[PDB]
Enzyme design. Structure first.
Site, mmCIF file in Angstrom:
data_model
loop_
_atom_site.group_PDB
_atom_site.id
_atom_site.type_symbol
_atom_site.label_atom_id
_atom_site.label_comp_id
_atom_site.label_asym_id
_atom_site.label_seq_id
_atom_site.Cartn_x
_atom_site.Cartn_y
_atom_site.Cartn_z
ATOM 1 N N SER B 116 35.478 44.618 44.100
ATOM 2 C CA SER B 116 35.645 44.246 43.261
ATOM 3 C C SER B 116 37.444 43.701 43.681
ATOM 4 O O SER B 116 37.389 43.418 44.751
ATOM 5 C CB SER B 116 36.098 44.398 41.936
ATOM 6 O OG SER B 116 35.038 43.639 41.121
ATOM 7 N N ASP B 233 25.459 38.101 40.568
ATOM 8 C CA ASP B 233 26.597 38.883 40.163
ATOM 9 C C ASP B 233 27.349 37.826 38.670
ATOM 10 O O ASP B 233 28.109 36.751 39.180
ATOM 11 C CB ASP B 233 27.625 39.974 40.984
ATOM 12 C CG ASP B 233 29.036 39.945 40.869
ATOM 13 O OD1 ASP B 233 29.547 39.426 39.877
ATOM 14 O OD2 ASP B 233 28.583 40.639 41.596
ATOM 15 N N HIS B 263 26.890 43.450 39.409
ATOM 16 C CA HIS B 263 28.194 43.606 40.196
ATOM 17 C C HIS B 263 28.992 44.616 40.414
ATOM 18 O O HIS B 263 28.784 44.909 41.680
ATOM 19 C CB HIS B 263 29.489 43.201 38.983
ATOM 20 C CG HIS B 263 30.514 42.933 39.558
ATOM 21 N ND1 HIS B 263 31.115 42.543 40.378
ATOM 22 C CD2 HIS B 263 31.792 44.024 39.525
ATOM 23 C CE1 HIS B 263 32.316 42.549 40.852
ATOM 24 N NE2 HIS B 263 32.982 43.783 40.455
#
Lengths: 291, 291
Positions: B116, B233, B263
């Site tokens: 991320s 996601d 995610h």
């Protein structure tokens, strides 16, 4: 007289099969010494033939897979008007016939598909017609996306009744150096007598447009595991097509590998690209042949 | 030195002191034997290095020396929660820790693994030292701004707001978009070291800075990478993964898409998570034999 290949060899002297239309297809087998762990069919591109997969087939045969293939109708040592086909599904039907024959001979084994370019569209559609049936698919620059062909160009559909008027009407030949960065492989391509280097006939172009449209309708239901190999500078099958396939396929097991600056024929590209291609197919199939 | 809010002195725990004089908490996973390679793990926004425990244990089982720290404003490190003077602080501090570790293990290859926001940090880290890293593994990396998010109007409005209310929360996210594994969402929701408050406007502007530096670093990014991305996601849209595959100049880039996954891919449904650990295992392992 005995049925012969377009190069005059009698079919009774070569491995072959006869398809549902009564046409002889030349066949090729690479069979390992011990019991095979798996079957894999190799589906060649437009204009080429199965003898171009000799090295790839030897690597797979080393994994204890029984590799097999045929020249598609209108190609290589098989029958039919050159690079012509009544409907694209004929390619798919013939692959399924060959795969079903091999599976009778080797029951219980998993069966993989490997396809390049137009051969990749054939593998996609073959797997889509039989969900759950193939253990996996390896695609090298598959034909998935129409080449930015305008609505005016597509109206060549008009010329198909022109290819009834003038059947041999051609779009005109490709520059062979768009194929691969590796010049030796370009020259090998230009000098292989079993390769048809003639420009793409309008009626065949329409069948390729049918393929691409059928592949798009099939991706919603394609669930076969696949590995997708694609060059970033491919002029024949745009890399954009490879990302669309990753996004729209429903497969749970899908892998994309992009080769930066590489052209269309990745298994015959510059030696560092070609070595990585062989190795990536080797590992992928190998892990799914332990399964 | 000072005490964490849990009352505990920062020098009591393994740590490092960054250029601004702040203590970062550090984590080490060392293999008994001599290590084949180093891998730095960079975590995402709001979370911390403790969440990479199972992954780090797997990597250590391959004989890699796995290391990490909690980014400033996160987990057990110092700093106001999820605030940073400039995004590049994160990258500087990663570089600091890497250079130390390299001094103790001269000649070892170093890998980066990021998730991320942690993935954007790794991308920026690699880009700042081209040729330096052996490879990068990115899970759902932050590479694209939210759709509305980056217009000149929205950026001006966020800067105006930052002048009077820099810590105003843009609103918390629904942690159910994190993962389809409801247990992992529940764990995420009850970890006291996780900051689940909404994003602050000042940090919102720094993540926009991060996305904008990422887009410029792409053309220069040459490090080998495996990219793993879920198709459903909602935090890092899969289209961002395709763009990364396309714009990076790395010769060695692989993408795997997990169909329907959210995610946090290393904490997703088990079929997804087991595949994620396996894929990272194979990919790092092939490039560690290489050393």
């Amino acid at each position: 007289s005995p049925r012969r290949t377009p190069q005059s060899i009698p079919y009774q002297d070569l491995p072959h099969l006869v398809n549902a239309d009564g046409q002889y297809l030349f066949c090729r087998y690479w069979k390992p010494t011990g019991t095979p762990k798996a079957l894999i069919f190799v589906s060649h591109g437009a204009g080429e033939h199965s003898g171009r997969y000799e090295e790839l087939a030897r690597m797979l045969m080393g994994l204890d897979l029984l590799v097999f293939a045929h020249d598609h109708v209108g190609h290589g040592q098989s029958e039919g008007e050159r690079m012509v086909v009544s409907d694209f599904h004929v390619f798919v039907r013939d692959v399924l016939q060959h795969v079903d024959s091999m599976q009778k001979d080797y029951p219980g084994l998993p069966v993989f598909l490997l396809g390049h370019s137009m051969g990749g569209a054939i593998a996609i559609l073959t797997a889509a017609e039989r969900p759950g049936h193939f253990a996996g698919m390896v695609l090298i620059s598959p034909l998935v996306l129409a080449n930015p062909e305008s609505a005016t160009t597509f109206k060549v559909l008009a010329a198909k009744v022109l290819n009834l008027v003038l059947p041999n009407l051609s779009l005109g030949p490709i520059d062979s150096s768009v194929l691969s960065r590796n010049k030796t492989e370009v020259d090998i391509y230009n000098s292989d007598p079993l390769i048809c280097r003639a420009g793409l006939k309008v009626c065949f172009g329409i069948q390729l447009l049918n393929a691409v449209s059928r592949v798009e309708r099939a991706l919603p239901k394609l669930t076969v595991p696949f590995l997708l190999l694609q060059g970033s500078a491919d002029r024949l099958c745009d890399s954009k097509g490879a990302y669309l396939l990753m996004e729209l396929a429903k497969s749970q097991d899908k892998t994309l590998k992009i080769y930066e600056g590489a052209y269309h024929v990745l298994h015959k590209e510059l030696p560092e690209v070609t070595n990585s291609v062989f190795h990536e197919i080797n590992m992928w199939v190998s892990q799914r042949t332990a399964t």
